[PDB]
């Protein structure tokens, strides 16, 4: 399903 | 190498500007240069490295999935173009994963002694092997899955010994390892178990937290519950 | 050159896949290769070229504006990094604009005899000179603005002679030339006049159109009205 | 203000 997005500092 | 002539501090500053400008390839290149200076990374610097590469590989993965879907539907003869282009994007994606893995191996993991840094890097190692596993099909595919598993497991063992159950990195590690079990290892029951246990142990530790820590931990807990809702 | 060994048809096919995958740099590279085959482009192929480069330069412009704003606010001493990085993105943006302009000059415009192709390419020429004007500051800046103006004017003169007032390319040309007047040439009254006249002349020709053409034209007319609402 | 987006074929 969803991993952590991890795309914003 | 490529960023060899730029000061470490300037690379970090430019990585932050590149994030603001949504220039994630540049952000990754600056952070690669910063790692290659040879010094350990601070918490903030580790996050910049991770954010940069998650954004680069995330765009590549999304493109790969669009192309793989078109290629599956093709298999009227469309010719070799869809396969060729999927292969090009796949090769690029592999190259970025290999680059991140190489930074971890030369030499971020071996110099990481504190639990927070070591767990952070081992989670990254699991994640980039997981992205390699998503596109793998040949003789080495089981070894790629096993490499992801091994990295995640070592991270989990350290995190359980050294971090509270609400720590955000421990939580995100558990979340991503559960996704690994569900999507990669064909172990949905292991995924569900790990997500439930992680959620419940975090819930029971929230009482110890400040308002701000509570917000950080509950956000990730909600991602665990979102997966459990989808999976059950 | 770079795409010299790939068939024209395969470049066009891959450009369409790259659009679906949101890989706009690849899309632009494929379309550049297609242009460099030396044949004229069809309507659909012109649109692929334009979409590819509008997306590439649009991301660069957005990044440039974020960096230029930070640099304006800087001017505590932050050091040379913000300026240096803005300059890097600016140089890249200029390079893409020069690439598109070079395709137009070698040899798309000179081989474009029909009004639809010629107007399309001259609108593109105006647009990429406008993007060069947005970042220009030196001895040549007036010449860059004049180059944009001249391209747009020739496109306008042809469009008014050869196309109905509802034609979408004629409409988009007028819209972008009005933006040029407002944002680049410091001529807000000329911008407002052109947008109003264009809108009104289109309105009066809608009766001639099919349902589908009506939808296409009214969409662009609404962009003209949106600018007029902001400007008046 | 707004030029035409021009970002979708
Ligand atoms: C892997 C991971 C864990 C935690 C975060 S966060 C949302 O910034 O606390 C990000 C990534
Ligand atoms: C310059 C331009 C004119 C018209 C279109 S459209 C919305 O596809 O009719 C696009 C770009």
Distance CA C61, CA C59 (A): 6
Whether C6 contacts chain B with CB within 8 A: no
Distance CA B54, CA B85 (A): 22
Asked if the Cβ–Cβ distance from C223 to D4 is below 8 Å, we say yes
Estimate to the nearest angstrom the gap between the alpha carbon of B87 and the chain centroid: 22
Asked if the Cβ–Cβ distance from D9 to C55 is below 8 Å, we say no
Whether C76 contacts chain B with CB within 8 A: no
Whether B196 contacts chain C with CB within 8 A: no
Resolution in A: 1.2
Distance CA B184, CA B131 (A): 10
Nearest chain B residue (CA) to C80: B10
Residue of C58, C65, C171 to mutate, testing the D interface (most D Cβ within 10 Å of its Cβ): C58
Residue C173 sits at the vertex; the CA angle it makes with C168 and C178, to the nearest 5 degrees, is 125
Residue B140 sits at the vertex; the CA angle it makes with B134 and B142, to the nearest 5 degrees, is 65
Whether B5 contacts chain C with CB within 8 A: no
Residues 79-108 of C with CB under 8 A from B: 79, 81-82, 84-85, 88-89
Report the length, in residues, of chain A: 9
Q: Is C177 exposed, middle or buried (0-12, 13-18, 19+ CB in 10 A)?
A: buried
- Domains in chain B with CATH codes: 8-232 (1.20.190.20)
Expressed in angstroms and rounded, the spacing between residue A7 Cα and the centre of ligand 1 is: 9
Nearest CA to ligand 2 atom 10: D6
Starting from the CA of residue B173, give the closest ligand.
1
Distance CA C182, CA C188 (A): 4
Distance CA B167, CA C104 (A): 56
Chain D: nearest CA to C151, how far in angstroms?
16
Nearest CA to ligand 2 atom 1: C172
How many other C-beta atoms are found inside a 10 Å radius of the C-beta of residue B74? 13
DSSP symbols for chain C: -TTTTS-HHHHHHHHHHHHHTT-HHHHHHHHHHHHTT-SPPPHHHHHHHHHHHHHHHHHHHHHHHHHHHHHHHH-----SHHHHHHHHHHHHHHHHHHHHHHHIIIIIHHH--SHHHHHHHHHHHHHHHHHHHHH--STTHHHHHHHHHHHHHHHHHHHHHHS-TT-HHHHHHHHHHHHIIIIISS-HHHHHHHHHHHHHHHHTTGGGS-HHHHHHHHHHHHHHHHHHHHH-
Residue B111 carries which DSSP code? H
Distance CA B24, CA B153 (A): 29
Distance CA B101, CA B112 (A): 15
Starting from the CA of residue C122, give the closest ligand.
2
List Cβ neighbours of C226 (8 Å cut-off, separation of 6 or more): D1, D2
Chain B residue numbers with beta carbons less than 8 Å from the beta carbon of C22 are 59, 62-63, 66
Residue B134 sits at the vertex; the CA angle it makes with B219 and B109, to the nearest 5 degrees, is 65
With tokens 């000061």, the residue in question is B7
Roughly how many angstroms between the first and final C-alpha of chain D, as a whole number? 22
Expressed in angstroms and rounded, the spacing between residue C186 Cα and the centre of ligand 2 is: 25
Starting from the CA of residue C179, give the closest ligand.
2
Cα radius of gyration (chain A): 7
Chain B: nearest CA to A5, how far in angstroms?
8
Q: For residue B49, what are its two tokens?
A: 């490295």
Residue of C223, C230, C231 to mutate, testing the D interface (most D Cβ within 10 Å of its Cβ): C223
Chain A residue numbers with beta carbons less than 8 Å from the beta carbon of B54 are 5-7
Q: Where would I find the beta strands (DSSP E) of chain B?
A: none
Chain C residue numbers with beta carbons less than 8 Å from the beta carbon of B78 are 13
Distance CA B212, CA B19 (A): 24
Distance CA B200, CA B220 (A): 13
Backbone angles phi, psi at C198, to 5 degrees: -60, -50
Asked if the Cβ–Cβ distance from A4 to B227 is below 8 Å, we say no
Peptide bond preceding B107 in cis form (omega within 30 of 0): yes
Whether B25 contacts chain C with CB within 8 A: no
Asked if the Cβ–Cβ distance from C51 to D9 is below 8 Å, we say yes
DSSP symbols for B191-226: HHHHHHHHHHHHHTTGGGS-HHHHHHHHHHHHHHHH
Candidate from B175, B220, B223, B224 with most ligand 1 atoms within 8 A of CB, to mutate: B220
Q: For residue C138, what are its two tokens?
A: 């030196």
User: Is the four-CA dihedral B152, B223, C20, C121 of positive or negative sign?
Assistant: negative
Expressed in angstroms and rounded, the spacing between residue B173 Cα and the centre of ligand 1 is: 8
Asked if the Cβ–Cβ distance from B70 to C23 is below 8 Å, we say no
Does chain D touch chain B (at least 3 C-beta pairs within 8 Å)? no
């Amino acid at each position: 399903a969803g991993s952590i997005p991890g795309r914003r500092s | 190498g490529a960023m060899g002539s730029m000061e470490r501090a300037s690379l970090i500053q430019k990585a932050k500007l590149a994030e603001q400008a949504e220039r994630y390839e540049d952000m990754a290149a600056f952070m690669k240069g910063a790692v290659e200076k040879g010094e350990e990374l601070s918490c903030e610097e580790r996050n910049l490295l991770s954010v940069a590469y998650k954004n680069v590989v995330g765009g590549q993965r999304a493109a790969w999935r669009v192309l793989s879907s078109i290629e599956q539907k093709s298999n009227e003869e469309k010719g070799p173009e869809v396969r060729e282009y999927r292969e090009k994007v796949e090769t690029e994606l592999q190259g970025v994963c290999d680059t991140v893995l190489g930074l971890l191996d030369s030499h971020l993991i071996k110099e990481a002694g504190d639990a927070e840094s070591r767990v952070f890097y081992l989670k990254m190692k699991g994640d980039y092997y997981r992205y390699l596993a998503e596109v793998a099909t040949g003789d080495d595919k089981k070894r790629i899955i096993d490499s992801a598993r091994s990295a995640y497991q070592e991270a989990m063992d350290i995190s359980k010994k050294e971090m509270p159950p609400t720590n955000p990195i421990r939580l995100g590690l558990a979340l991503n390892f559960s996704v690994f079990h569900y999507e990669i290892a064909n172990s949905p029951e292991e995924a569900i178990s790990l997500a439930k246990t992680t959620f419940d142990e975090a819930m029971a530790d929230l009482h110890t937290l400040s308002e701000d820590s509570y917000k950080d931990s509950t956000l990730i807990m909600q991602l665990l519950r979102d997966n459990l809702t989808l999976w059950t």
